């Protein structure tokens, strides 16, 4: 059908080579010549030559270049035949059926959001306004601010304050999918709750970067809006980062802190031989934090701290045991973000990358998924803060 | 991430041979035939 082989206008007046209508034209030309020689009863040599030429015209239309010289267009580039339409990377199957361009999608450069929770991403408000546009139109109609479609379109174009309030209402719990190419594993696409931010760059949670193989030296990411209730619930239950903290390849956690978070935890859990405040005996982590913030005790000071830790019993209740621990001020301070049920020994050491990963493993094994996500976010906040303070 | 003589035991433990036979020897130490 001709609408599947259109003629693309170039500057209106002239058309580019379709590369498919040309082969059809050659086939028709040779067929007409063979017909006008068939009724003519011409000598058999030229009739046979025309039959042969019609044959190469036909098999060039079907599969150009499969046998013999590849029939050439105006430029030396071979003509694209019918077989080329359906095969190869640019063929129909791989370019339009196994993958395709989609609506309700965008992309932008990614920057680090260190304040974000694991389930949140930072979405520019202009991108959100464009992406969620039909939802905005629906909400505008719902509360009567826009009588017609055009009224809602004009209000969104003018970017009125009530439009921004409606946009805030729509995206409150509507997850979005963030993707970074190459998508090497399912975790290359993950769901996040968007938070409206100023600027034009998408903010990414640090702990998911390893899953994306993402960094912030120029990386760009695509965002997609799950439209239907089924898609939204699939994003929340199947693809949300807080539900996908384990690698499907080996079962190990993917959200282990790296770089400056690890540096901060290591620095605050290191011990110094003659640090300020050494030998002090503290009522608990709160006193350690008070002494550190007031400058009366060094972060690496070896001290004695009364620590109350919790251990699960046979029936699963948290039995509390309180004891005096020989530790550091920084380890006691870090103990405050450790959820109940983990032993104090998990922090009573210089915490490197492997130690932090083991701590997250212990938290996941003992307490489950939600406390693990909360613990990971708290660890990342503490690591950032104390790496900065160091 | 992918990039395109004589045996010695190094730890304490008992020795076990499988698919092995015991035969007379010149020095008394078993040869292997399988």
């Amino acid at each position: 059908p001709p609408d599947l082989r259109p003629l693309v206008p170039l500057d209106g007046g002239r058309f580019a080579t379709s590369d498919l209508n040309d082969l059809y034209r050659r086939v028709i030309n040779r067929n007409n010549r063979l017909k006008r020689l068939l009724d003519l009863a011409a000598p058999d040599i030229i009739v046979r030559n025309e039959k042969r030429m019609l044959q190469e015209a036909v098999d060039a239309l079907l599969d150009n270049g499969r046998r013999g010289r590849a029939i050439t267009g105006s430029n030396k580039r071979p003509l694209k035949s019918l077989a080329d339409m359906i095969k190869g990377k640019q063929g129909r199957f791989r370019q339009n059926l196994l993958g395709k361009r989609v609506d309700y999608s965008g992309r932008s450069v990614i920057t680090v959001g260190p304040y974000l929770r694991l389930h949140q991403c930072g979405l520019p408000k202009k991108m959100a306004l464009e992406l969620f546009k039909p939802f905005i139109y629906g909400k505008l109609e719902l509360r009567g601010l826009a009588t017609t479609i055009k009224a809602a379109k004009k209000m969104v174009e003018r970017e009125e304050a009530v439009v921004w309030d409606i946009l805030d209402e729509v995206i409150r719990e509507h997850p979005v999918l963030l993707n970074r190419a190459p998508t090497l594993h399912r975790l290359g696409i993950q769901a996040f709750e968007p938070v409206l931010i100023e600027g034009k760059a998408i903010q990414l949670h640090p702990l998911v970067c390893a899953a994306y193989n993402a960094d912030f030296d120029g990386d760009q990411m695509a965002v997609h809006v799950p439209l239907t209730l089924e898609a939204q619930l699939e994003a929340r239950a199947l693809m949300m980062s807080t539900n996908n903290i384990l690698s499907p390849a080996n079962g190990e956690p993917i959200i282990v802190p790296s770089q400056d978070v690890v540096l901060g935890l290591y620095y605050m859990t290191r011990d110094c031989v003659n640090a300020k405040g050494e030998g002090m005996v503290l009522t608990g982590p709160k006193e350690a934090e008070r002494l550190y913030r007031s400058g009366l005790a060094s972060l690496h000071a070896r001290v004695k701290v009364r620590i109350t830790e919790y251990e699960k019993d046979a029936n699963g209740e948290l039995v509390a045991k309180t004891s005096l621990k020989d530790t550091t001020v920084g380890r006691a301070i870090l103990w405050m973000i450790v959820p109940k049920g983990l032993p104090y020994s998990i922090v009573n050491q210089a915490l490197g990358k492997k130690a932090i990963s083991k701590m997250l493993n212990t938290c996941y094994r003992i307490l489950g998924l939600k406390p693990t996500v909360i613990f990971a976010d708290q660890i990342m906040y503490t690591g950032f803060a104390y790496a900065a303070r160091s | 991430q992918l990039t395109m003589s004589s045996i010695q035991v190094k730890n304490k433990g008992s020795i076990k041979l499988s698919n092995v036979k015991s035969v007379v020897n010149s020095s008394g130490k078993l040869v292997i035939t399988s």
């Binding site: 059908p1 001709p2 599947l4 | -």
Partner: protein, 49 residues
């Protein structure tokens, strides 16, 4: 974009997919080698029927 056309060919023409794509379906179906089919179809020889 749904309605197709047809071209009534003045003479019969062989489909290249069923000729060149190895194994030659015409050649295997007839046991005449692909070379002879190529020469006859492309007017270099004759076949007795």
């Amino acid at each position: 974009r749904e309605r197709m056309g047809h071209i009534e060919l003045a003479s019969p023409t062989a489909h290249i997919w069923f000729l060149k794509s190895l194994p030659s379906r015409i050649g295997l179906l007839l046991d005449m080698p692909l070379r002879d089919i190529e020469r006859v179809l492309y007017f270099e020889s004759y076949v007795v029927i």
